[PDB]
Amino acid sequence: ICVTTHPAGCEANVKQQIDYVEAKGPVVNGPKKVLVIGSSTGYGLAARITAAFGSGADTLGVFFERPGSESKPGTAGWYNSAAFEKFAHEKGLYARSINGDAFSDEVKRLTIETIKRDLGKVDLVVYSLAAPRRTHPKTGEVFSSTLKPIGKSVSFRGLDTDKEVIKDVVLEAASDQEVADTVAVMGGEDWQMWIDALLEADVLADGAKTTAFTYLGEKITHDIYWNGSIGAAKKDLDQKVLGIRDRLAPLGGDARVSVLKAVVTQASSAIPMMPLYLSLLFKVMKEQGTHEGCIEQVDGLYRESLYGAEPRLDEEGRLRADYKELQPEVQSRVEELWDKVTNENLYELTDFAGYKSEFLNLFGFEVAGVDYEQDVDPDVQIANLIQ
Numbered sequence: 001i002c003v004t005t006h007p008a009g010c011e012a013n014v015k016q017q018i019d020y021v022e023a024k025g026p027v028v029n030g031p032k033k034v035l036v037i038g039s040s041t042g043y044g045l046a047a048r049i050t051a052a053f054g055s056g057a058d059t060l061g062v063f064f065e066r067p068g069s070e071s072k073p074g075t076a077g078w079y080n081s082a083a084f085e086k087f088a089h090e091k092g093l094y095a096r097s098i099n100g101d102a103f104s105d106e107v108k109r110l111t112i113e114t115i116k117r118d119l120g121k122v123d124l125v126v127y128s129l130a131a132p133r134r135t136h137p138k139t140g141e142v143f144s145s146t147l148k149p150i151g152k153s154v155s156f157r158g159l160d161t162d163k164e165v166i167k168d169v170v171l172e173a174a175s176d177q178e179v180a181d182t183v184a185v186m187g188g189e190d191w192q193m194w195i196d197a198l199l200e201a202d203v204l205a206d207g208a209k210t211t212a213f214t215y216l217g218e219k220i221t222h223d224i225y226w227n228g229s230i231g232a233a234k235k236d237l238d239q240k241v242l243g244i245r246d247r248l249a250p251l252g253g254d255a256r257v258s259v260l261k262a263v264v265t266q267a268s269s270a271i272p273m274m275p276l277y278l279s280l281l282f283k284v285m286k287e288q289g290t291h292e293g294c295i296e297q298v299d300g301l302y303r304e305s306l307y308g309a310e311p312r313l314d315e316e317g318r319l320r321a322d323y324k325e326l327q328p329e330v331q332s333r334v335e336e337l338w339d340k341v342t343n344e345n346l347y348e349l350t351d352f353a354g355y356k357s358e359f360l361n362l363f364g365f366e367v368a369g370v371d372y373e374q375d376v377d378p379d380v381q382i383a384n385l386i387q
């Protein structure tokens, strides 16, 4: 499926996230100069909005988005970032962006150069890259990530989102090479490179923090995710953060892996089993009153753990914001309903309507307060953007 991009709806999407953060009040003792790698959509965009509008932080964002021209709309992340900087410049904040491949050495060189000239040093480094592939910045070798289980193939009842049909599917296992590629793409090496390079150039302030986002889920998803190929990459993140945290010790800084809840993004809608899992989870958590989106998760992570008094930790040293999803009352009902979902009860036993709505929100469609019978103007420019 292709969904075009609605510029006006994307801006209203950014404004609504800004409104949520501002209503919750300032982030006490928060960061003032934040670098967000992957700052145009999803959790990274939420992190940039929480920093700028919760803490009054200057933000430098790195993303990879297609710009807009006459009669050809760019990607949603382009209009998201364009709207973010427009709102941020209003409040008096510094907001600049870099459009390029964050895995490359040149973007790191440009980011360091921009920080020196524009900010000096940064308070916090948010690492939220979601890429299906990575080109190694030293051997040009391209790695492509895979979402398969390890060991045994898995059967389950999926959901054809186009035909709106429950399908019997089978996911084959992953070879040792597919897992190695997935670790190269989604592991911690590039995050490790980022902090190293930022340390040599001395653009990390005293007590600087860095965090990378991850997902653990519960038992229903462990075969595909956590104990699959993608989980081996996130498992590599937990090994890398121990090294990162050490290099930040002479500064008095910290490095943490932050676990967030499952959310409809462009990167998770592709994962197997996710459309049906999200449709069920949305219904169970809505009737329970714990349904949360991107901005609620990251705003809470800033306030309670990243810069709070009593951080929500686990026994591995990770900051946690996903606890409501993993609760037995939520998980056990999702597991019970999964089998009883057929083509006829789709909208009655699941929140497939909510999943579809939130998926179209990513592109600027079905956003409250937007007039969708007006001509779309796709030529939106971003002042002082660096390519």
Ligand SMILES: NC(=O)C1=CN([C@@H]2O[C@H](COP(=O)(O)OP(=O)(O)OC[C@H]3O[C@@H](n4cnc5c(N)ncnc54)[C@H](O)[C@@H]3O)[C@@H](O)[C@H]2O)C=CC1
Residues within 6 Å of the ligand: 037, 038, 039, 040, 041, 042, 043, 044, 062, 063, 064, 065, 077, 100, 101, 102, 103, 128, 129, 130, 131, 213, 214, 215, 259, 260, 261, 262, 263, 264, 265, 266, 267, 268
């Ligand atoms: N989406 C979810 O349900 C969950 C996501 N997470 C994690 O949070 C992180 C963020 O993912 P999402 O927000 O879901 O994805 P997303 O697709 O919404 O965000 C990806 C971001 O990274 C940027 N990006 C991608 N490839 C790039 C490249 N080569 N160079 C520069 N920028 C690049 C994109 O421009 C975008 O800003 C991921 O590590 C994901 O595993 C955490 C928990 C669950």
